[PDB]
Amino acid sequence: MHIRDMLAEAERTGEPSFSFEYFPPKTAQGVQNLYDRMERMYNYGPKFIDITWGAGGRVAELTCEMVVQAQAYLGLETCMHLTCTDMGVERINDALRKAYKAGCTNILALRGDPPRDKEKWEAAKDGFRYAKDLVAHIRKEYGDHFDIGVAGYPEGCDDNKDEDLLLDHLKEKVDMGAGFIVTQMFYDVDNFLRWVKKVRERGISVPIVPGIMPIATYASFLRRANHMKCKIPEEWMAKLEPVKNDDVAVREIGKTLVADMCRKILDAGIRHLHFYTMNLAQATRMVLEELNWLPQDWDEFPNGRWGDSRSPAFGELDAYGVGLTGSNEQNRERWGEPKCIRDIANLFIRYLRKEIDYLPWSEAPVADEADLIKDELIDLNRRGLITVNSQPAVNGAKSNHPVHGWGPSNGYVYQKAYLEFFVSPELYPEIKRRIESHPDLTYHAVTKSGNLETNAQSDGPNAVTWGVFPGKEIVQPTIVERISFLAWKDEAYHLGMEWARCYDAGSPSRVLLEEMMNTWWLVNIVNNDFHQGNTLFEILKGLEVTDLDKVP
Amino acid sequence: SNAMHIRDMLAEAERTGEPSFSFEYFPPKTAQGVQNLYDRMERMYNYGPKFIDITWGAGGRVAELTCEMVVQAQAYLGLETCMHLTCTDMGVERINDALRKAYKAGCTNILALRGDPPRDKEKWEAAKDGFRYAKDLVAHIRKEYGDHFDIGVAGYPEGCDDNKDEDLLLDHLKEKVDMGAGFIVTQMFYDVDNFLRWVKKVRERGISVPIVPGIMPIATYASFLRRANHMKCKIPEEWMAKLEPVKNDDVAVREIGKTLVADMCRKILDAGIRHLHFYTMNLAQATRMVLEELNWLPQDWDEFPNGRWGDSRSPAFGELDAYGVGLTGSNEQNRERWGEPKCIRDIANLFIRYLRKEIDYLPWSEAPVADEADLIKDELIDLNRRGLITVNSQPAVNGAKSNHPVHGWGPSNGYVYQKAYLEFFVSPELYPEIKRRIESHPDLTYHAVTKSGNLETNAQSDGPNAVTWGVFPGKEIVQPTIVERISFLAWKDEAYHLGMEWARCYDAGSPSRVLLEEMMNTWWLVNIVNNDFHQGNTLFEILKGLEVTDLDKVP
Amino acid sequence: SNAMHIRDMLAEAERTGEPSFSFEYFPPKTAQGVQNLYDRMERMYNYGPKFIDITWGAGGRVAELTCEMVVQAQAYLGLETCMHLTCTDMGVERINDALRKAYKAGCTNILALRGDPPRDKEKWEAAKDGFRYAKDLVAHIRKEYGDHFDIGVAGYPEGCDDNKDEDLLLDHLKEKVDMGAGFIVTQMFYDVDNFLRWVKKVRERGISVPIVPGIMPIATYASFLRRANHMKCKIPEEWMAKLEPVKNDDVAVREIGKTLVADMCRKILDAGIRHLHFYTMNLAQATRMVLEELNWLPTQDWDEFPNGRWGDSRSPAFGELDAYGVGLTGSNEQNRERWGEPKCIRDIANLFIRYLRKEIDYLPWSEAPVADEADLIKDELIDLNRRGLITVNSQPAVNGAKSNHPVHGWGPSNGYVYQKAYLEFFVSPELYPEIKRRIESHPDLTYHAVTKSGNLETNAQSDGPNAVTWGVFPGKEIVQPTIVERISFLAWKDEAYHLGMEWARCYDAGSPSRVLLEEMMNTWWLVNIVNNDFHQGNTLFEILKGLEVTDLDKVPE
Ligand SMILES: Cc1cc2nc3c(=O)[nH]c(=O)nc-3n(C[C@H](O)[C@H](O)[C@H](O)COP(=O)(O)OP(=O)(O)OC[C@H]3O[C@@H](n4cnc5c(N)ncnc54)[C@H](O)[C@@H]3O)c2cc1C
Ligand SMILES: Cc1cc2nc3c(=O)[nH]c(=O)nc-3n(C[C@H](O)[C@H](O)[C@H](O)COP(=O)(O)OP(=O)(O)OC[C@H]3O[C@@H](n4cnc5c(N)ncnc54)[C@H](O)[C@@H]3O)c2cc1C
Ligand SMILES: Cc1cc2nc3c(=O)[nH]c(=O)nc-3n(C[C@H](O)[C@H](O)[C@H](O)COP(=O)(O)OP(=O)(O)OC[C@H]3O[C@@H](n4cnc5c(N)ncnc54)[C@H](O)[C@@H]3O)c2cc1C
Ligand SMILES: C[S@@+](CC[C@H](N)C(=O)[O-])C[C@H]1O[C@@H](n2cnc3c(N)ncnc32)[C@H](O)[C@@H]1O
Ligand SMILES: C[S@@+](CC[C@H](N)C(=O)[O-])C[C@H]1O[C@@H](n2cnc3c(N)ncnc32)[C@H](O)[C@@H]1O
Ligand SMILES: C[S@@+](CC[C@H](N)C(=O)[O-])C[C@H]1O[C@@H](n2cnc3c(N)ncnc32)[C@H](O)[C@@H]1O
Ligand SMILES: C[S@@+](CC[C@H](N)C(=O)[O-])C[C@H]1O[C@@H](n2cnc3c(N)ncnc32)[C@H](O)[C@@H]1O
Ligand SMILES: C[S@@+](CC[C@H](N)C(=O)[O-])C[C@H]1O[C@@H](n2cnc3c(N)ncnc32)[C@H](O)[C@@H]1O
Ligand SMILES: C[S@@+](CC[C@H](N)C(=O)[O-])C[C@H]1O[C@@H](n2cnc3c(N)ncnc32)[C@H](O)[C@@H]1O
Ligand code: NA
């Protein structure tokens, strides 16, 4: 009923004590599948489950829906996460009332991320600048009804804090009435155990709950670590390097790595483990088997926004909710102050030339599979077709191919060429006309506020990467599909706006980026003939956005 | 249930002209198939059938499963069921057991059938028990259960039964109806004119009970042809002509077939025959489509099965004709077409005759040899000459265009792929060597087993292995052909059974029988897949210089 | 529950003279012990106690368990509970948390206690929080809960909480009572004349609240003596005399003790003190027996005879249980006075040898003075300690001594008793690997070894219980009072390393003595070795011959 009590019992008995965190899926089908997965995984015997809070809102209704479904109908003990600065007092109160009626008695009280547009920062005027304010609020309005957790950071935090100040701030939050701490994910257990010592020496006595993230896939492992700024031991990276492109092998090794880390934590007397499942069952199950703590695999291996959208695990899962990293100042420092289209284009070309690691829409630095199409990509961007994502055609590379290879060995892998880009409304009609004339191309196109255009008649899923491996069915990690694409549309236009808001209200940069997002089309083109490398670039060869140097 | 008798339901269909139809299902070959079938039966019940039929497995191997399903359908899912039941295949205790189960389930409708007599005849219990013909089962049900069960019997518009003699057939049909059958269900047909003429003949013979036409929707071109040819069932040239342009694309075939069958159904309805009985083959889509076309309406992952090569999780899995039975013709007819083999070489020559297109069917053959065997014909022949008796095969294909005249399938502007595979019988003496050779080549997956022994394989996980797939515009990868443990074991049992049923076409002491029985009791069935689909020949290379000894030895 | 206050229950006892008694239980050390305790509490409630007490674990850790048990007892089993609670050991948040839990459980009676102050008073949060004495907790409960809880406080007839100056003690008792306590519960005693004189003193000081005598039935001779000596508690010479003929047979001891304690109780009842509070030590039998003797009544004897940390860990009664407080007794000053100021390993070794030579009565890890069964192995024990293998506990092999043997005998007569030799000691991490290597070479030895913060090493594959003392008696199953078992050993590990640290903290923050003792506890292994061949006396000492800890005279930096 209260987590602090469950934790106290874990600390006394040393019994198997663990919990699972889930996030709100991006698809309706994902939500239904998640409920099934939550039911199955509850038989592993977690003391409770966490449901994350979507930064801002929109999915507020979904989080509350799911807490109600889990707590009230499925009879799963839930801890609801809740942010404050990204919202207002009415939305906070609404969430608390819903959690109350649902039978939830555990809140993880969080700040969330401050708005970039500080002119429109209601929560701070409302007295919700920090997580401590939410802890205080819950205690004042609901007394002892809710047990309250707070976030702890063994390896520091995004905002500009030395460790001493961070622990002072942690003590403030705990002293407002939080019964436990939940840490951000980590893979350096020595640093974690040192941090625990520091926390106790600061006079913070509440139970500490380590955030454990099992390794489902090499990509999500790295991307989530780098995003959370999270040292991976050289021992681990070394052990994974031989098999990084085979996620079955990665997961097998990671099982042992993470389970060993968990044993070091348990032997240190920290007895409750909090698993970030990423809405997947297998990696968590595997770690629990390794710990001897135990009493449907079709979406085992997600691929960011390119996997099956029916999976609970679908989407780019680097952070707790939508947006760019870094201070407004830092983002102006990395991406400059663009006054026109050409400036944006040059930024993107810098990305393609490996001079910048991250664009606003970039999960990661430019991949090696761009090397042989780099000039064509650069050419598009010069002409103002701002490329967001791409892949080359591949016609049966060996699965150990250093650039193109993935999965187990003695396989062959295939890729349909695709291209995804922003383009001006002036130029879109022509692009449409040209694609429609070539019937072996599938396209999806949409504006921020408009309707989806496509030539796909059925518009079911289209496989654009697949693999043939001994003794196996065809593996299809990369899909282009209507629902996946619309899910991305919303995020992409949002990221553009969050970029715009790194600049001042009247600024050239802001008005430029906002006009772009409100008028430009996001376009995805797939060439279903995977024998052909260049036909997408050929189709787009004459086309240029005019007024590349125009300043608003 | 509720004392509902089909004869009354049919009388009402004939009076009202209301939408009146029923769906036949068969017992699936896999446990997963069974579960999936229950879901499908639930979904399809919303189309509004008056009832559903569940078929009886020839012999009563799957008798427990049929009964399980009738109970599940009638008693738990609340679906009005007619249970099929055979008699000559079984004996009195098994018949009574099935009837008692159908009784307790709340079933009130039986389709009373003979099934196929045993080939041996020395071991024919049912005839000893007085169950030689379906009429005997009709009489039995009436004696033991009175009016509780309404009883259907089989009718044959295009001859069938055991002999097409004609007229004698209608006399025999009248005998069975007069034993106390309330209705007739016909075997499938596609010649509606012949059907309507047959109906006239049936009535003129003084048989007045309601006639229910067996309608088979076209799910796939292959199953359409194979089931028609097996049932000896005239397909109009009109139909064959209209399907030929698109025979290798089953989406297109099914679209055309919707119209063909719906048109046929309209001709039947206009003739005053008002209840349609659909053979679903445990698939929903083709039946749904025909009903949409008639305006009779109020999980497509397995829409396109591929005999024993499709997904074994599908209800529709398996090679689906003649109710699970075995081999088709008279013992005489089978001796006439397959000869009287005295040794291994005789069998080999029979198989080579098959490969050379000189005979259309082997005991293990769904169909005549495909064109995709033409470019590997010599190697197949070579194996059979050396006594590696090939049952099934396919060549490697590395991205043929989907319109390729031999290799192509599915829609256009696609590419299709095949892993080479080989399936064959081999002597126990030679199997150890074959095993040793396969194990040395790690890119080969193999499955091997005897009639009575355990499955050997190098597949560690032994999940499904895709051996035919296709890449089509705007689609996920299509995988019609799978080699999988469950599929293979399902086949093992059937293959060794077919061999024994072949043996029993010959006399008890005969050279042919003792030969075939020794072979089935000792030889291994082996399936080898070359996962490198860039390579055509490595399977044949691996098996070069292996020969079964004593090819001419007569037992 | 039901607003029932103990002061009213006591007033009724005093008016009616009805059978009025209560049972104290403590939080068990084992999960299995907890479950067994619930069963015992259920059974014993049929004896008809007015309520039960649940003790508070000094410091915490088991705070959760105390609260769990109060909830289980009060809320689910329907047993009227009085929850004990300390304050100086804790802080304001933990106190409030405990009170809130007792509140929600339906408890309406608290025994308000100080507990023991930290030895390192630099780290004393509770005193900054305004919780220096029990009176502060009494005041706090009254302020936060008003009349909801009736509050008891501790009384000391024989002068044993911190100081013994009886005048000052009674002044302080009056302060506590006047803060809003409704009753007094005394520490255990066996001198009834002193008790009745004390009551007179209490009343003459102007303290009128009901007094509840703490009665401890005699379960075993060992626990009787150890608890008495530890609480500094005069046992009458009449009692010692009457027990001496049969001290090694606990059945006989318990039979005699039934009469002794029941007679004492009758003297108390005739004096007009009508409610008896029994310290059960989580055992049923001795309390039952006293109640039968008083005519106050209206297998599960498998653990009737515990043996400190050596008995079955599944018993509720398992563990040492000399005090409430999981630490060493006495002022920091007093402890420095008796154990000196050790600067190096040799100093500690000499302290231990002084213990072995009967020159000091108590080491930090010592329940009692050295036993007579050490006499014939004393030189070998001394030899180990000289070499820096600091021995904590030991026993000789015994191969079927008669049960009346003056040194080795125990239990009833015409029996035979057996002991596996065992040795338990602290050893440096430098030397442990060698000891391990040597034990592993001798397969008839079972060992358990562990550090303060490290994992358990052992050669026991199943690692179930190993019997190291047993007895064969006429008409009986084999009696197995002494067991070495994983759970028992880990329970002890934690306590042993804690006692070492509590010793360290008797010295100043920077001091040689403290840094020495802390380094030792944080780095040295606790090792238990059993020689399963009980025909062999000396093979443990042989195995460990020529091992020596280096830097015995080195003084830390
Ligand atoms: C286990 C866990 C779960 C999470 N779940 C979610 C989730 O569901 N949804 C989501 O959007 N995010 C989530 N987050 C992310 C979190 O919202 C971000 O890290 C966010 O930036 C703030 O974290 P916080 O609540 O710890 O903020 P705070 O504890 O307020 O700290 C925020 C910053 O302000 C500083 N600070 C604190 N007090 C003061 C003060 N008095 N004066 C000045 N500066 C101060 C801190 O040092 C720090 O730099 C989660 C994080 C963790 C570790
Ligand atoms: C709608 C339908 C459903 C079927 N369902 C199944 C099923 O679920 N399971 C299964 O195993 N099979 C099934 N069958 C197949 C059937 O069992 C075979 O066709 C079988 O070989 C004949 O069975 P019958 O009941 O039609 O035979 P019968 O009507 O007994 O005819 C059998 C043969 O004996 C002849 N004959 C009949 N009476 C006499 C007589 N008095 N004297 C001499 N000769 C006689 C007939 O002319 C014919 O040649 C079904 C057939 C149909 C049409
Ligand atoms: C019946 C009983 C039950 C107990 N139960 C438990 C239990 O469950 N758990 C546990 O940990 N311990 C328990 N104890 C032990 C108790 O916690 C210790 O004996 C403790 O050291 C003193 O407890 P107290 O409440 O009497 O302290 P207090 O009455 O506060 O006094 C303790 C010492 O401080 C002195 N003192 C008091 N007031 C002042 C003042 N104003 N100025 C100066 N000195 C002062 C006293 O004279 C005495 O020397 C129990 C004791 C008894 C008698
Ligand atoms: C497409 S590969 C990336 C390889 C390379 N960067 C390229 O050129 O595409 C990444 C995807 O493959 C998936 N994957 C890797 N190994 C797999 C395996 N054994 N089975 C299934 N999916 C696998 C991952 O989970 C991820 O979704
Ligand atoms: C996650 S991978 C997609 C590959 C695909 N999922 C697969 O299975 O191979 C992202 C790809 O887009 C490319 N990319 C990233 N940012 C880009 C940009 N701004 N413009 C064009 N291509 C970009 C990367 O170099 C990489 O090839
Ligand atoms: C593998 S192809 C035939 C191979 C080879 N050309 C031959 O005929 O010997 C036949 C299989 O493909 C399936 N099939 C045909 N068209 C299809 C389509 N459009 N979508 C999915 N499966 C299809 C059929 O149902 C059957 O399972
Ligand atoms: C139903 S198809 C199976 C292949 C599958 N439909 C596909 O995806 O191509 C049967 C195949 O086995 C071959 N075959 C049939 N009988 C054979 C035999 N006795 N020996 C060897 N090959 C045989 C046919 O020529 C054909 O290629
Ligand atoms: C708890 S008593 C008795 C243990 C056990 N119940 C028995 O039957 O002997 C512990 C035993 O170890 C001895 N002992 C106590 N402290 C010791 C120490 N520091 N070093 C060695 N032996 C010690 C005692 O003299 C006694 O023989
Ligand atoms: C291990 S023996 C040692 C006694 C004494 N040091 C001696 O040997 O002279 C003491 C323990 O034996 C057990 N004990 C004594 N008498 C017993 C009896 N009659 N039945 C069962 N256990 C008994 C109790 O658990 C007691 O703590
Ligand atoms: Na904990």
Residue numbers in the entry:
A (entry chain A): 1 to 295, 337 to 593
B (entry chain B): -2 to 295, 337 to 593
C (entry chain D): -2 to 295, 336 to 594
Sentences from the paper on this structure:
Additionally, by introducing a human patient mutation, Arg357Cys (Arg315 in cMTHFR), we successfully crystallized cMTHFR in its inhibited, T-state, AdoMet-bound conformation. The cMTHFRR315A mutant was successfully crystallized, and its structure solved to 2.8 Å. The most prominent structural feature of the retractable-hinge region in the R-state is the presence of an α-helix (aa329–337); most of the retractable-hinge region could not be modeled (aa296–336) in the T-state, indicating increased flexibility and/or increased solvent exposure when compared to the R-state, where it was embedded between the catalytic and C-terminal velcro-wedge region. The combined effect of these changes explains the catalytically inhibited nature of the T-state, where the Tyr361 and the C-terminal linker (Tyr finger) act as an autoinhibitory element, a form of intrasteric (active site-directed) regulation.
Methylenetetrahydrofolate reductase (MTHFR) is a pivotal flavoprotein connecting the folate and methionine methyl cycles, catalyzing the conversion of methylenetetrahydrofolate to methyltetrahydrofolate. In addition, AdoMet acts as an allosteric regulator of MTHFR and a feedback loop regulator in folate and methionine metabolism.
